[PDB]
Design an enzyme around this catalytic site. Sequence first.
Site, PDB file in Angstrom:
ATOM      1  N   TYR A 198     -14.341  -4.381   2.814  1.00 23.84           N
ATOM      2  CA  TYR A 198     -13.041  -4.665   2.222  1.00 23.84           C
ATOM      3  C   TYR A 198     -12.940  -6.163   2.031  1.00 23.84           C
ATOM      4  O   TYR A 198     -13.279  -6.926   2.947  1.00 23.84           O
ATOM      5  CB  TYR A 198     -11.894  -4.179   3.119  1.00 23.84           C
ATOM      6  CG  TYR A 198     -10.542  -4.628   2.600  1.00 23.84           C
ATOM      7  CD1 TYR A 198      -9.876  -3.902   1.621  1.00 23.84           C
ATOM      8  CD2 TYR A 198      -9.964  -5.807   3.052  1.00 23.84           C
ATOM      9  CE1 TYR A 198      -8.657  -4.316   1.128  1.00 23.84           C
ATOM     10  CE2 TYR A 198      -8.740  -6.232   2.562  1.00 23.84           C
ATOM     11  CZ  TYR A 198      -8.095  -5.489   1.602  1.00 23.84           C
ATOM     12  OH  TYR A 198      -6.885  -5.933   1.120  1.00 23.84           O
ATOM     13  N   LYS A 226      -6.158 -15.625   7.087  1.00 27.26           N
ATOM     14  CA  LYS A 226      -5.446 -14.917   8.161  1.00 27.26           C
ATOM     15  C   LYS A 226      -5.119 -15.822   9.367  1.00 27.26           C
ATOM     16  O   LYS A 226      -4.127 -16.555   9.338  1.00 27.26           O
ATOM     17  CB  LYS A 226      -6.161 -13.616   8.568  1.00 27.26           C
ATOM     18  CG  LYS A 226      -6.001 -12.489   7.533  1.00 27.26           C
ATOM     19  CD  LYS A 226      -6.371 -11.131   8.123  1.00 27.26           C
ATOM     20  CE  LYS A 226      -6.103  -9.957   7.185  1.00 27.26           C
ATOM     21  NZ  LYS A 226      -7.285  -9.658   6.305  1.00 27.26           N
ATOM     22  N   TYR A 237       0.818  -1.208   0.000  1.00 25.47           N
ATOM     23  CA  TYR A 237       0.000   0.000   0.000  1.00 25.47           C
ATOM     24  C   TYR A 237       0.854   1.261   0.000  1.00 25.47           C
ATOM     25  O   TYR A 237       0.520   2.237   0.658  1.00 25.47           O
ATOM     26  CB  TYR A 237      -0.962  -0.023   1.201  1.00 25.47           C
ATOM     27  CG  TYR A 237      -1.766  -1.307   1.269  1.00 25.47           C
ATOM     28  CD1 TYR A 237      -2.576  -1.687   0.208  1.00 25.47           C
ATOM     29  CD2 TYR A 237      -1.703  -2.139   2.382  1.00 25.47           C
ATOM     30  CE1 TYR A 237      -3.297  -2.866   0.242  1.00 25.47           C
ATOM     31  CE2 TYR A 237      -2.437  -3.319   2.445  1.00 25.47           C
ATOM     32  CZ  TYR A 237      -3.227  -3.671   1.365  1.00 25.47           C
ATOM     33  OH  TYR A 237      -3.951  -4.836   1.397  1.00 25.47           O
ATOM     34  N   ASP A 288     -17.528 -13.175   4.241  1.00 23.76           N
ATOM     35  CA  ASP A 288     -16.078 -13.078   4.232  1.00 23.76           C
ATOM     36  C   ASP A 288     -15.625 -12.991   5.699  1.00 23.76           C
ATOM     37  O   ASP A 288     -15.710 -11.917   6.325  1.00 23.76           O
ATOM     38  CB  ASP A 288     -15.650 -11.840   3.440  1.00 23.76           C
ATOM     39  CG  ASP A 288     -14.151 -11.665   3.387  1.00 23.76           C
ATOM     40  OD1 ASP A 288     -13.441 -12.369   4.132  1.00 23.76           O
ATOM     41  OD2 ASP A 288     -13.688 -10.801   2.597  1.00 23.76           O
TER      42      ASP A 288
HETATM   43  C1  LIG Z   1      -7.282  -9.677   5.053  1.00 22.47           C
HETATM   44  C2  LIG Z   1      -8.639  -9.767   4.431  1.00 22.47           C
HETATM   45  C3  LIG Z   1      -8.852 -10.294   3.067  1.00 22.47           C
HETATM   46  C4  LIG Z   1      -7.737 -10.790   2.190  1.00 22.47           C
HETATM   47  O1  LIG Z   1      -6.641  -9.891   2.084  1.00 22.47           O
HETATM   48  P1  LIG Z   1      -5.209 -10.565   1.785  1.00 22.47           P
HETATM   49  O2  LIG Z   1      -4.271  -9.383   1.764  1.00 22.47           O
HETATM   50  O3  LIG Z   1      -5.358 -11.260   0.446  1.00 22.47           O
HETATM   51  O4  LIG Z   1      -4.964 -11.503   2.946  1.00 22.47           O
HETATM   52  C5  LIG Z   1     -10.144 -10.376   2.572  1.00 22.47           C
HETATM   53  N1  LIG Z   1     -11.218 -10.008   3.277  1.00 22.47           N
HETATM   54  C6  LIG Z   1     -11.159  -9.498   4.518  1.00 22.47           C
HETATM   55  C7  LIG Z   1     -12.422  -9.103   5.231  1.00 22.47           C
HETATM   56  C8  LIG Z   1      -9.843  -9.342   5.155  1.00 22.47           C
HETATM   57  O5  LIG Z   1      -9.754  -8.821   6.378  1.00 22.47           O
HETATM   58  C1  LIG Z   2      -2.978  -7.176   4.368  1.00 29.72           C
HETATM   59  N1  LIG Z   2      -4.054  -7.065   3.357  1.00 29.72           N
HETATM   60  C2  LIG Z   2      -5.403  -6.874   3.971  1.00 29.72           C
HETATM   61  C3  LIG Z   2      -5.480  -5.698   4.780  1.00 29.72           C
HETATM   62  C4  LIG Z   2      -5.640  -4.439   4.193  1.00 29.72           C
HETATM   63  C5  LIG Z   2      -5.694  -3.278   4.962  1.00 29.72           C
HETATM   64  C6  LIG Z   2      -5.599  -3.349   6.350  1.00 29.72           C
HETATM   65  C7  LIG Z   2      -5.654  -2.170   7.130  1.00 29.72           C
HETATM   66  N2  LIG Z   2      -4.365  -1.464   6.970  1.00 29.72           N
HETATM   67  C8  LIG Z   2      -4.067  -0.592   6.003  1.00 29.72           C
HETATM   68  C9  LIG Z   2      -2.810  -0.210   6.192  1.00 29.72           C
HETATM   69  C10 LIG Z   2      -2.384  -0.864   7.268  1.00 29.72           C
HETATM   70  N3  LIG Z   2      -3.395  -1.620   7.691  1.00 29.72           N
HETATM   71  C11 LIG Z   2      -5.434  -4.599   6.950  1.00 29.72           C
HETATM   72  C12 LIG Z   2      -5.379  -5.761   6.178  1.00 29.72           C
END
Ligand SMILES: *Cc1c(COP(=O)(O)O)cnc(C)c1O
Ligand SMILES: CNCc1ccc(Cn2cccn2)cc1
Lengths: 430, 430
Positions: free
Chosen positions: A150, A276, A18, A247
């Site tokens: 998300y 996760k 990011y 999800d």
């Molecule tokens: C972390 C997360 C995902 C998947 O993100 P990755 O970066 O691919 O692990 C999808 N959905 C939700 C609600 C999440 O918190």
């Molecule tokens: C790690 N990919 C999923 C994910 C995306 C955003 C966040 C929240 N976040 C954004 C920047 C730092 N943390 C947590 C998990």
Amino acid sequence: LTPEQIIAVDGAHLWHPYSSIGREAVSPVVAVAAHGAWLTLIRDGQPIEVLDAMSSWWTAIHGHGHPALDQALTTQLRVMNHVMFGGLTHEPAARLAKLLVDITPAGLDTVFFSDSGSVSVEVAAKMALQYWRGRGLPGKRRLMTWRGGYHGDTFLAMSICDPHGGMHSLWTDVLAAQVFAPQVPRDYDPAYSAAFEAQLAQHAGELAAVVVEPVVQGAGGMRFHDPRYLHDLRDICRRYEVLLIFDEIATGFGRTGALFAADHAGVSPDIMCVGKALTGGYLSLAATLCTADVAHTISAGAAGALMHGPTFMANPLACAVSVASVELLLGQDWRTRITELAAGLTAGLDTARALPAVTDVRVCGAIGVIECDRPVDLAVATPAALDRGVWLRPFRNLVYAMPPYICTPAEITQITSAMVEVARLVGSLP
Amino acid sequence: GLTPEQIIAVDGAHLWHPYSSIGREAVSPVVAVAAHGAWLTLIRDGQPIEVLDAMSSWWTAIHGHGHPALDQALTTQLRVMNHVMFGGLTHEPAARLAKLLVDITPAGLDTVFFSDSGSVSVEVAAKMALQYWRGRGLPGKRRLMTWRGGYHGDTFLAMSICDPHGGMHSLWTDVLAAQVFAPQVPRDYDPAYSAAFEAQLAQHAGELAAVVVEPVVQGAGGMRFHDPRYLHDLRDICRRYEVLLIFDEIATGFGRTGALFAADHAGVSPDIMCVGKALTGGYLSLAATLCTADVAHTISAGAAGALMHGPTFMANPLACAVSVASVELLLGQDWRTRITELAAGLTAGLDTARALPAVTDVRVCGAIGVIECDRPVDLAVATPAALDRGVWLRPFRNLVYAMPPYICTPAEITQITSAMVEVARLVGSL
Ligand SMILES: *Cc1c(COP(=O)(O)O)cnc(C)c1O
Ligand SMILES: CNCc1ccc(Cn2cccn2)cc1
Ligand SMILES: *Cc1c(COP(=O)(O)O)cnc(C)c1O
Ligand SMILES: CNCc1ccc(Cn2cccn2)cc1
């Protein structure tokens, strides 16, 4: 490599999440060890011990280097590191599938393993779309969700991210155009559900599925909503023949105080994603579960096979450590553990409510959140947290923790105290 | 777990396998109970038999299973630090692997974005390409161009560059992003093909972000080989028409085609490159997307902002540590001679297949050996035939092929090719 060498290589060659490479004000901190709830980080050339208050992005539920999980990995490493799941099966996949079907909401009896959360969401969507192709209704091809959500970073997953405030907002013009209901409120309001139903009814003939994070929306803003909304979604989806997808990649494995957040409502989705905390934070793994009826119908009519198959699908190493992680969770009184964690977070975060830059303080299971009146500056927050022996990673206007379940009450208090002090500096504040 | 019959029962009830219709597959998965070196231990009629992993477990196990150096690298890392989040932290395995990858890949690729799967790395490559042109102020450049016969993974954007005329994702073409496809690249070099590709690209240049291809060998789409000179032409075309060039080396990387990367056969560098599969020596899921300095800098130029991607398990220490060992083990030996010897062995062993009635072609490229048949290969016949000859083969479509571990002895290659020939003989007896 010395920590200085690592920093040099990292700055030259590593793209971080990011981020704009070569343009970030806050450089990465070198991590050199992790044990239990603690990380060893390098700061000013010296090792410091800090609490992993983030559980390494919400994965390390049993902490790092747990002997049961370590040994599950090394035991499998000796026997069989990996074989292709195209044509072969194995014990770790079978053990893990059996566990997952048993502990997930009733009716989810089929498991598709993948290598990451975003992929598991793509698989869930593919299942839903192919289901309707199998039913001879290929017009059912859109997804519906509520705002604030998300679901990962791959392109279909991006299409159900919050369109305005979500991280993927700039991509709206090239994403699949999905249906969005308004932000689900925290408190239960029957009018919200009535409006959701009316909107869904209008689009039902073109909707394959509703996809939502149950109870807690994580990366979109750490928002909580009343579990009764999930009961309503289940009812609406059943009556209008739209599949329901939960999800649970962030909410799974005890994080919200129930084994899965769906359990707060007693609801079973048609399809569910987990990831996760699935592996206890050791290795990448995810899974998409669905009902027998969904699985069968996906290949009904002329729809054919589900054309998905990650190279490392059902990886023995990742499955073996996940089995150990899940068994370790189930073998203890996890419900009491999370209740105690929630109580510690609540007690520890209470003084933040009175701080001038704090808008809200909220706790749900092992999730504690201070919402601030402005975006949190990492250049200020990070040293303040490290100075107090805690690793925190704020995002947007949120100072929050999702700590390992093994944190003692004293450790939770240390974490919450650091959070309060970070919040004090948000509005301290020159 | 734990007996093979228990595994079979759980598997049948709960596990979805790749590219399949669960509950409708004629050929059941074979139980694998161990893997070591070039060999798997599989259950046939309740009995454990050792067979050669002729597939390298979907093209990943280049040093075999349970190689002591790779096992050791994993266990060493496990004792110090299993995983930390890459959002805000960095570490030695990520730095070591990034440095290795930038050094050994085609010239100019100096930035590494790690991910958890090959399909994701392709989506990241696409996101990079699109965001690059947004940073250049040309958001109209948003389509991809490729040639037919290709395969790039199973997530929805990756599916869009799979060949829609008979590729595995062909049923989805109506809902995928509409990309530009040039005809199938021929095996032999024909300048007229490149001239036509150029004329087609020229017409679309203003809406094209990138050309994306598998260099030299197209794997999952049909095990087709093309003259490396075509890649030289693509580089030149892309340069002259201002379109990025992306090489997907997820199947071709790390020596498989006789060069370290297939691009090296042509002596060209893409702007963006994807690697995976053999990256970890087949231990764990990992992938990477590399790009040039210009791509990295531009991507966040022109107010384009951060690259909004970040897998939870990004740059996982365990996966990175075992990948470092795998890459170093490859580089520390005369891999080029090893692959040349493997190619000679495959050629010698497969030659007798040319005369078989159902065989249309026999072709070898590095450690890749292919018998192409005139009809689909029935797995129900091929599988036990190969197993009885001590070899695990996984044909698909009309292809009987091997991508064996680099550690295979001449005797082992002779055994693999003999099994392949017998499978091909059986195909032609209908
Ligand atoms: C972390 C997360 C995902 C998947 O993100 P990755 O970066 O691919 O692990 C999808 N959905 C939700 C609600 C999440 O918190
Ligand atoms: C790690 N990919 C999923 C994910 C995306 C955003 C966040 C929240 N976040 C954004 C920047 C730092 N943390 C947590 C998990
Ligand atoms: C294997 C492969 C991929 C990625 O597929 P996964 O199932 O995600 O590993 C992408 N491109 C090519 C050319 C491949 O061979
Ligand atoms: C494992 N995902 C990538 C991939 C896809 C198809 C193939 C070829 N194949 C298809 C069925 C069995 N093998 C190889 C790798």
